[PDB]
Point group: D2
Amino acid sequence: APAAVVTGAAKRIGRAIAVKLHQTGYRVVIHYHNSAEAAVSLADELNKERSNTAVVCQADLTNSNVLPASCEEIINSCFRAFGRCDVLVNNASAFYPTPLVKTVETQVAELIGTNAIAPFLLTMSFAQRQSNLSIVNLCDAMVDQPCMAFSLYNMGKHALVGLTQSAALELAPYGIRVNGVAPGVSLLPVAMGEEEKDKWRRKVPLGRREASAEQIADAVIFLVSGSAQYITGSIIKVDGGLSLVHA
Amino acid sequence: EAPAAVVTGAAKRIGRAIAVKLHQTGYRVVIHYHNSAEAAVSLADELNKERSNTAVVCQADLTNSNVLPASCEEIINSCFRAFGRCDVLVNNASAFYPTPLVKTVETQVAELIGTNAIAPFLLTMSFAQRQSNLSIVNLCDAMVDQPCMAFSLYNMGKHALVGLTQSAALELAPYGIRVNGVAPGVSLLPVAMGEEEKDKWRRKVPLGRREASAEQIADAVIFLVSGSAQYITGSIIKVDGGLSLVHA
Amino acid sequence: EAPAAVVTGAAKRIGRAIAVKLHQTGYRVVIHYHNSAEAAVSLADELNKERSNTAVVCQADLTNSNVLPASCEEIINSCFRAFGRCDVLVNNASAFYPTPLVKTVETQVAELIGTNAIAPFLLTMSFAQRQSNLSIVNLCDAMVDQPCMAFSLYNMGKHALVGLTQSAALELAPYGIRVNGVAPGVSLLPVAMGEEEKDKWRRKVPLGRREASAEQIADAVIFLVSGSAQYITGSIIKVDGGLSLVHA
Amino acid sequence: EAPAAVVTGAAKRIGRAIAVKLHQTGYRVVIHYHNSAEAAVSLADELNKERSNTAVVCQADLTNSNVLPASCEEIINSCFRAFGRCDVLVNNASAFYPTPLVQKTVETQVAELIGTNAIAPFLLTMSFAQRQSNLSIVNLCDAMVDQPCMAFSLYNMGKHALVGLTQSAALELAPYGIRVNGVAPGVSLLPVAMGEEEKDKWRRKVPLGRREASAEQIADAVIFLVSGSAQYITGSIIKVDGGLSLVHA
Ligand SMILES: NC(=O)c1ccc[n+]([C@@H]2O[C@H](COP(=O)([O-])OP(=O)(O)OC[C@H]3O[C@@H](n4cnc5c(N)ncnc54)[C@H](OP(=O)(O)O)[C@@H]3O)[C@@H](O)[C@H]2O)c1
Ligand SMILES: NC(=O)c1ccc[n+]([C@@H]2O[C@H](COP(=O)([O-])OP(=O)(O)OC[C@H]3O[C@@H](n4cnc5c(N)ncnc54)[C@H](OP(=O)(O)O)[C@@H]3O)[C@@H](O)[C@H]2O)c1
Ligand SMILES: NC(=O)c1ccc[n+]([C@@H]2O[C@H](COP(=O)([O-])OP(=O)(O)OC[C@H]3O[C@@H](n4cnc5c(N)ncnc54)[C@H](OP(=O)(O)O)[C@@H]3O)[C@@H](O)[C@H]2O)c1
Ligand SMILES: NC(=O)c1ccc[n+]([C@@H]2O[C@H](COP(=O)([O-])OP(=O)(O)OC[C@H]3O[C@@H](n4cnc5c(N)ncnc54)[C@H](OP(=O)(O)O)[C@@H]3O)[C@@H](O)[C@H]2O)c1
Ligand SMILES: Nc1nc(N)nc(NC2CC2)n1
Ligand SMILES: Nc1nc(N)nc(NC2CC2)n1
Ligand SMILES: Nc1nc(N)nc(NC2CC2)n1
Ligand SMILES: Nc1nc(N)nc(NC2CC2)n1
Ligand code: NA
Ligand code: NA
């Protein structure tokens, strides 16, 4: 059985991706930062289905002097548990506004670390340890029509597009594919107000609703599958047409 | 009962692989063709041997002309006539040849722009006008921003097809019709292409230094028409082995 | 001696402003028009009052048809007959109206795809064939990836024009002919559009909550044809006040 | 009074060309530099001999660190100290070197490549805006970001982030009348460290003249963007690449 690492997998979209990978037959490493209880509850659920097929792994993915070592250890955790690491899903992400007009350098470390630098370091560590091997990066369908006052977040997501492309090119000779999935509106942020959630939903052409986490996870499953073996450097929007709607 | 799909230019090559994979997934298929009558009938016979009354052929020229709207309406009609429904449209048929800036040019326009862009638009119109998982898949080109030299009309047509994909995704979303694309890089090389040229293209592809099989292209089409793509509309999936990421 | 430019659809609105600014920069101009003869002639008279023998008009329908290649060749020829040279081509003329998926459709195709894409292609062919700072500027649309609802053929035509811009840039670079685009967002609105509707569009624009003047669009054209742009080819400059960056 | 501009990494090469062209257009200029003190001072001396008290130098490292926000604030402050205003910011400074995925610390490479190409532009943009006619920012991008050089992931990441900043900042700063645009070279001045045969390999790829862009050609697009001829243009990135990005593998 192949094995996958999913970052930020205790809740929401990460959780659904881990669940669907496990349902497909993968053993999974459930990475978490603060959500230890949820991470272990997910592992307990998956291990009840198939013993010793899910483990948890804690790490902060904020940029720092220790982030390279932390990312090496996440990949190492998959090898320790399962003896291989076939799939990496870069899902973990900080998301909050950073107006141009926490210290700003902490915001940099968190927003650019989680969205871009940790994915890069995890990609390095994944590759260095190297079958259907692939990486899937969780992008953002709205990167070119960004939310107001979210410059660092947007920078991080653009950087992640860059990594997707650069790593697809560089890792192709190792048979490692690198792709992305770009939600528009999926599970709305827990802190967003109801009326705000509804305003976003009403903008989506395809059903005037957000994507379920499972719909996002379906695109991840496709990209890691045998049915995507010639696909690398591609980013699949799963956005219900939202990015096509003008102001 | 079983859903039904129209695949244009389905007698050979990628369209044939798409038709076969849709049929294997459970669809009844309209095999559109232009000149390749014997291949189209042979494919229909193959599919009907597997499940009777699940494949028919439909002949049409998709060159632009004043009768092209009627021709595209008749392809969609032919699906309803055979199967009583039309769930999926795959716009695959395509003319591809150079048109240097420096057949008459009017014919070149009609063929390249008609097959790659206008016929998809008219088929899209007719599909939409006539009707649980409805979708359209347009065969695009991953290299449209790094185009082949002296292929301006072809490239224009494929860019127009991106525009149609996006515009139709937006407009047809309220009807539950998703509209997406699949963009090959190099897949089955042109029959006309010489061996050395084919080898030069193959050697450019990062992932495996080989072209895509027809089946690999069809796999992306199958995903986009499936239940696993129900929130996906207006997306174009490159299936190019990284080719478009390679600088000059 | 003075360079010469062809501007399509130059009688009114953005094309007129472009022709004026090119003339102010020192170009002789061919004012192409279709229906707006009186305005074309008035512009020519104004320009020739400023400097005699510097402006001529040229009538043609740019709808797609069997005669469009000849018509386009004639427009280019008119610049050579008048001025002895043709240094700049500005593809500005454009039909724009909705074509819902759900006039006959073949005429809509001819008009929308002809004016926005096929006539630019044929004009580009004829320009190149007759061939220093030579360049072509195509009037694109900054909103082509977030298009107006029910404008599929228009959007297809503008996408095709992006592809032409790219393809022609690549192919014509060895002749030193640069090919670029200018992409307005909201510029001149219909005069007859109610101000309340105009204001809905204006309020969308981040930079000043107003539409671009024709002259602001023309400024970008002037840059691209200038000596300050001699390494720029295949580039499309948005002149949109940030509109294309604004989400739904 | 004459307007004032800050050009990062302006001692040499493209940045100097931009500073020179802005100065010739009537701007007073802050010549930011990191290690090239001699070159920076030489340029300032030359510009002040054309017009007295119209150029100053400003030294800063633009590597990311917890003091980078203060350093960026101080570059903008230096423009106001010398000239009383700051109308234009050109984010030109850039680290550029490979970072292979498979095998000087990686954290240093992150701090340099992401800091110079993205974070310092962001912080300078914040400081520029907080301190405020024809105000604008021009970011030096890269026309090849979607067809990147092999083994340059962190550089490419940085330049993609800079695209994101250009767009985000154009949106957010539009109500302040600050336009934010980019200029994206393909091949311009080749690296000093490259041999002529390798330079020629790159030159031969360029459809328009089989040559790199001069520094002045890049600067010409910057000057257009800061000019009155670009007053409705924001969020736009102009490729100045001779068609290079249109050429397939
Ligand atoms: N939801 C949407 O509509 C949407 C739209 C566009 C893009 N996306 C992208 O899709 C992905 C999943 O979205 P989501 O909404 O499910 O994400 P989310 O709930 O915002 O974040 C996912 C997880 O990231 C982890 N994380 C955050 N900061 C971290 C840090 N410093 N170190 C390590 N891990 C950290 C958290 O793990 P712990 O809980 O364990 O601390 C969190 O549960 C993200 O990449 C997001 O950007 C989502
Ligand atoms: N192969 C590749 O590497 C590649 C690369 C990029 C994109 N694509 C796209 O993928 C699709 C499939 O590629 P392919 O190589 O399999 O295509 P293809 O063999 O060039 O053409 C497919 C079929 O199009 C039909 N067709 C051509 N002109 C027509 C006309 N005037 N009216 C009606 N039908 C017409 C032909 O049908 P008859 O034989 O019955 O006459 C032909 O067999 C095309 O859209 C192509 O542009 C392919
Ligand atoms: N206005 C905007 O906000 C906006 C936004 C985005 C892009 N653009 C682009 O900018 C350019 C100029 O826009 P505009 O608003 O000034 O254009 P416009 O007023 O819609 O049209 C310009 C001219 O095109 C000519 N034209 C139309 N159909 C033709 C045909 N069949 N044959 C020949 N010529 C034909 C007409 O010439 P006659 O009057 O002589 O018949 C007309 O005056 C266009 O390419 C447009 O798509 C404009
Ligand atoms: N040259 C090309 O072909 C090309 C192609 C694509 C994009 N571009 C972009 O165009 C811009 C100019 O290119 P270029 O070739 O002229 O650049 P460059 O010579 O590589 O670098 C410009 C300057 O950046 C400064 N810099 C580097 N690291 C720094 C740091 N840690 N802190 C502060 N400043 C630092 C250096 O200043 P000091 O010398 O004072 O240390 C250097 O002179 C860059 O943004 C580049 O990415 C250029
Ligand atoms: N990390 C990230 N990124 C986006 N775009 N949206 C969200 N959504 C909610 C914070 C949970 N999360
Ligand atoms: N229609 C089309 N389009 C492309 N890109 N390639 C091909 N390949 C060869 C004519 C079969 N055909
Ligand atoms: N995008 C576009 N294209 C043309 N040809 N004309 C127009 N006219 C504007 C609605 C007045 N807009
Ligand atoms: N900063 C930067 N960025 C690019 N692309 N090219 C260059 N040339 C560098 C001096 C070698 N520098
Ligand atoms: Na830790
Ligand atoms: Na008239």
